[PDB]
Design a protein around this motif. Structure first.
Motif, mmCIF file in Angstrom:
data_model
loop_
_atom_site.group_PDB
_atom_site.id
_atom_site.type_symbol
_atom_site.label_atom_id
_atom_site.label_comp_id
_atom_site.label_asym_id
_atom_site.label_seq_id
_atom_site.Cartn_x
_atom_site.Cartn_y
_atom_site.Cartn_z
ATOM 1 N N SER B 1 43.442 28.626 44.628
ATOM 2 C CA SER B 1 43.114 27.496 45.493
ATOM 3 C C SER B 1 41.791 27.737 46.236
ATOM 4 O O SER B 1 41.468 27.054 47.213
ATOM 5 N N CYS B 2 41.013 28.692 45.733
ATOM 6 C CA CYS B 2 39.754 29.316 46.132
ATOM 7 C C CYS B 2 38.556 28.629 45.455
ATOM 8 O O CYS B 2 38.635 28.254 44.281
ATOM 9 N N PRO B 3 37.425 28.444 46.133
ATOM 10 C CA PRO B 3 36.281 27.751 45.504
ATOM 11 C C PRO B 3 35.724 28.555 44.343
ATOM 12 O O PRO B 3 36.101 29.720 44.142
ATOM 13 N N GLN B 8 40.038 35.239 45.056
ATOM 14 C CA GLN B 8 41.160 35.147 45.983
ATOM 15 C C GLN B 8 42.058 36.373 45.859
ATOM 16 O O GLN B 8 42.652 36.601 44.801
ATOM 17 N N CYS B 9 42.174 37.140 46.946
ATOM 18 C CA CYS B 9 43.073 38.290 46.975
ATOM 19 C C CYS B 9 44.480 37.888 46.581
ATOM 20 O O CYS B 9 45.032 36.921 47.117
ATOM 21 N N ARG B 10 45.070 38.656 45.662
ATOM 22 C CA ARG B 10 46.351 38.260 45.089
ATOM 23 C C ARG B 10 47.437 38.166 46.156
ATOM 24 O O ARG B 10 48.136 37.152 46.255
ATOM 25 N N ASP B 25 34.603 49.103 47.597
ATOM 26 C CA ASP B 25 35.097 48.891 48.946
ATOM 27 C C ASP B 25 36.333 48.010 48.877
ATOM 28 O O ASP B 25 36.352 47.018 48.146
ATOM 29 N N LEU B 26 37.365 48.371 49.631
ATOM 30 C CA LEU B 26 38.632 47.641 49.595
ATOM 31 C C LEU B 26 38.563 46.530 50.630
ATOM 32 O O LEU B 26 38.791 46.763 51.821
ATOM 33 N N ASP B 27 38.249 45.317 50.175
ATOM 34 C CA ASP B 27 38.075 44.185 51.073
ATOM 35 C C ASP B 27 39.282 43.277 51.145
ATOM 36 O O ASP B 27 39.380 42.474 52.080
ATOM 37 N N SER B 32 42.994 44.086 45.446
ATOM 38 C CA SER B 32 42.849 43.339 44.199
ATOM 39 C C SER B 32 41.406 43.304 43.723
ATOM 40 O O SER B 32 41.157 43.314 42.514
ATOM 41 N N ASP B 33 40.446 43.247 44.653
ATOM 42 C CA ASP B 33 39.045 43.239 44.260
ATOM 43 C C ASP B 33 38.695 44.477 43.446
ATOM 44 O O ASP B 33 38.009 44.380 42.424
ATOM 45 N N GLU B 34 39.218 45.638 43.832
ATOM 46 C CA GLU B 34 38.818 46.893 43.210
ATOM 47 C C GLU B 34 39.719 47.330 42.055
ATOM 48 O O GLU B 34 39.281 48.128 41.205
ATOM 49 N N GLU B 35 40.954 46.842 41.989
ATOM 50 C CA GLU B 35 41.776 47.125 40.824
ATOM 51 C C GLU B 35 41.401 46.159 39.690
ATOM 52 O O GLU B 35 40.553 45.275 39.858
ATOM 53 N N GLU B 36 42.038 46.358 38.518
ATOM 54 C CA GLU B 36 41.700 45.748 37.219
ATOM 55 C C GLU B 36 40.192 45.738 36.972
ATOM 56 O O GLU B 36 39.669 44.878 36.261
#
Ligand code: CNC
Ligand SMILES: [Ca+2]
Ligand SMILES: [Ca+2]
Ligand SMILES: [Ca+2]
Lengths: 121, 81, 381
Positions: B1-3, B8-10, B25-27, B32-36
């Protein structure tokens, strides 16, 4: 310390000029530098500026004057094209620390130069 | 639901710019940003060895990595290297 | 001696927070206010799930505009952003985090060079920057501390108060041990200066100065008689409803909850907090007036009662022959230019009311009574 302007002088319309803002005691990467003009009997206006870490122009100058930085010098040049009469003024360059993305055109910089006279006929 | 420009963090369901996806960096709360995933300086200044930034010699060995490569903090605790 | 704001019923803090709650839904960079987020977290109150969105918006705007905008955020605002990180029990951290800190160090460095002189911003913003760094246990050089040290020209109670907070953090953290003896003289003398500025009504130079003066006074053990004088003072003005400004409310809530900015050394994110839950006929005539310019402007403007000085200025502009410019700040619209003249360096456009008495609130909080004359004055400082 401070910064010094030069390159200014008489020319006739349709001419070229190059203003030189040479910056002494400023760390290379960290300040916004900008060029400002004050014509006789007029408030100081924001002309052009080069970004700390991009470019912003004043729309009266769109396509006319263009800023750039010499890699050896630590100087920034406002190259002046397509000259008209109302571009007559003294020209100051200035320095501010504002790591915000752009440089700003509004006249709030912290280190100001002496100005170099540029007149046109 | 993100532009379209943001990831969008899971878990948290919040919106994070793609500049932040895969930057070490874990934001997001879960990660989720840094995994996969997968000119010169001045007198009393100093050059980071691998980057073009200048930093005053007093930020050398001060506890904080003021260079991207952390070089300002490398040799501290021993003479030279 | 000892400096205590006794315990109170929920309602005065309740309605004091109801003036904070609408801002929690205004996440445009133009309005995002880290001072607000800090004071909520340090308070008896909370806004629940809104606080995480509010923090996220800050971490979004501040990190994207300084590490990647429309101008700003400011370096001083960056310092408050760090305090918000502590307020959530975080240390500035990581690659984006490390860069932010170096930026804020560069600020402290530029300002130190300019002093050589005044700082380009303020000694307030200068000590605010040192204190944010010290709160994330980042160190600043002894030479940086020295500029602050010497600064205690004449200073307001807020300026000394914020200096005091910066030094208290240095001491408690054992930072800059090269100056240890001089930080404690500075802390001492900052205390002695705030007490001198007590007004007969009981305030430390202004009602607005008192929150910060109390935060600094609260950290370091005449003392209690002044602090009781302060609390009556403060309490009367809350009943008179003096606190309408969000930033002011955000500096006062920590005191009401027995906390200061120095408590962000050891943040307490779990202590429970009470959940915050959400026209006139008259026309009055204010005479707006500017004498610093020739020939002077003086006119009567007709606006609805309850209007602010801002409301008047707009109307004077609409009717013709008056212009002004404002810029955004954490405290609301700041008046930068009046009638084409802009405040120069070490200058500001001061606001006054009759008789030659400076206002203690800005153009969007002061509501003039029918008949009051309001001055805009270009004053050096
Ligand atoms: C030095 C200072 C002080 N000031 Co002045 C004082 N003395 N101020 C400013 C200076 C600004 C320039 C500078 N180089 O910083 C100074 C003295 C010129 C300015 C102007 C005056 N100040 C006066 C007061 C009383 C406000 N100021 C404070 C912020 C009082 C501050 C003390 C405090 N407890 O906060 C203060 C100590 C520091 C503000 C700061 O740095 N904040 C931190 C910064 C990180 O956040 P910021 O939002 O980005 O900072 C900018 C704004 O705060 C803005 N600003 C400053 N004052 C105001 C006031 C209002 C009402 C608004 C909307 C914006 C501002 O200037 C800062 C950047 O330059 C406020 C607490 C002070 C107080 N002790 O009462 C007070 C408003 C209280 C309230 N109910 O809202 C103003 C009304 C006074 C007047 N009668 O004219 C007046 C502003 C009028 C206007 N043109 O709109
Ligand atoms: Ca910039
Ligand atoms: Ca990331
Ligand atoms: Ca370092």
């Amino acid at each position: 310390r401070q910064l010094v302007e030069s390159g200014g002088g008489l020319v006739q319309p349709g001419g070229s000029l190059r203003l030189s803002c040479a910056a002494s005691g400023f760390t290379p990467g960290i300040y916004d530098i900008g060029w400002f003009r004050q014509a006789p009997g007029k408030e100081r206006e924001g002309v052009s500026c080069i970004s700390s870490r991009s470019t912003n122009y004043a729309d009266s100058v769109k396509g006319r004057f263009i800023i750039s930085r010499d890699n050896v010098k630590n100087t920034v040049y406002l190259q002046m094209n397509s000259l008209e009469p109302e571009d007559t003024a003294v020209y100051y360059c200035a320095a501010i620390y504002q790591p915000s993305n752009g440089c700003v055109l509004r006249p709030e910089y912290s280190y100001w130069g002496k100005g170099t006279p540029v007149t046109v006929s | 639901s993100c532009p379209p420009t943001k990831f969008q963090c899971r878990t948290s369901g919040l919106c994070v710019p793609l500049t932040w996806r895969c930057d070490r960096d874990l934001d997001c709360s879960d990660g989720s940003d840094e995994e996969e995933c997968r000119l010169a300086c001045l007198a009393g200044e100093l050059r980071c060895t691998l980057s073009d930034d200048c930093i005053p010699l007093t930020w050398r060995c001060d506890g904080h990595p003021d260079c991207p490569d952390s070089s300002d903090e490398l040799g501290c605790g021993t003479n030279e290297i | 001696e000892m400096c205590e704001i006794p315990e109170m019923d929920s309602h005065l803090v309740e309605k004091l927070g109801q003036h904070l709650l609408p801002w929690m839904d205004r996440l445009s960079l133009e309005h995002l206010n880290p001072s607000i987020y800090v004071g909520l977290r340090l308070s008896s109150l909370q806004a629940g799930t809104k606080e995480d969105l509010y923090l996220h918006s800050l971490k979004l705007g501040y990190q994207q505009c300084l590490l990647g905008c429309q101008g700003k955020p400011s370096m001083g605002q960056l310092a408050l952003y760090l305090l918000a990180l502590r307020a959530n029990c975080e240390f500035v951290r990581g690659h984006k985090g490390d860069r932010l800190v170096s930026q804020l160090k560069w600020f402290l460095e530029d300002e130190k060079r300019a002093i050589g002189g005044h700082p380009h911003t303020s000694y307030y913003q200068y000590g605010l920057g040192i204190l944010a760094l010290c709160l994330h246990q980042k160190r600043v050089h002894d030479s940086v501390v020295d500029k602050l040290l010497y600064a205690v020209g004449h200073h307001s109670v807020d300026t000394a108060a914020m200096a005091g907070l910066a030094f208290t953090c240095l001491k408690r953290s054992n930072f800059n041990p090269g100056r240890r003896q001089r930080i404690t003289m500075a802390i001492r003398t900052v205390q002695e200066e705030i007490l001198k500025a007590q007004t007969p009504e009981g305030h430390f130079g202004n009602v607005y100065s008192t929150p910060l003066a109390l935060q600094f006074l609260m950290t370091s053990p005449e003392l209690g008689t002044a602090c009781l004088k302060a609390r009556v003072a403060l309490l009367a003005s809350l009943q008179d409803g003096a606190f309408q400004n969000a930033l002011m409310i955000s500096q006062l809530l920590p005191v009401l909850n027995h906390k200061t900015y120095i408590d962000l050394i050891f943040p307490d994110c779990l202590a429970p907090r009470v959940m915050l839950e959400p026209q006139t006929q008259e026309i009055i005539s204010v005479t707006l007036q500017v004498l610093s310019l020739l020939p002077p402007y003086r006119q009567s403007i007709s606006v609805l009662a309850g209007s602010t000085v801002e409301d008047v200025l707009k109307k004077a502009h609409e009717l013709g022959g008056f212009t002004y410019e404002t810029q955004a700040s954490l405290s609301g619209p700041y008046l930068t230019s009046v009638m084409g003249k802009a405040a120069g360096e070490r200058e500001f456009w001061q606001l006054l009311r009759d008789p030659n008495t400076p206002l203690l609130q800005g153009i969007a909080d002061y509501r003039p009574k029918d008949g009051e004359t309001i001055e805009l004055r270009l004053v050096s400082w």
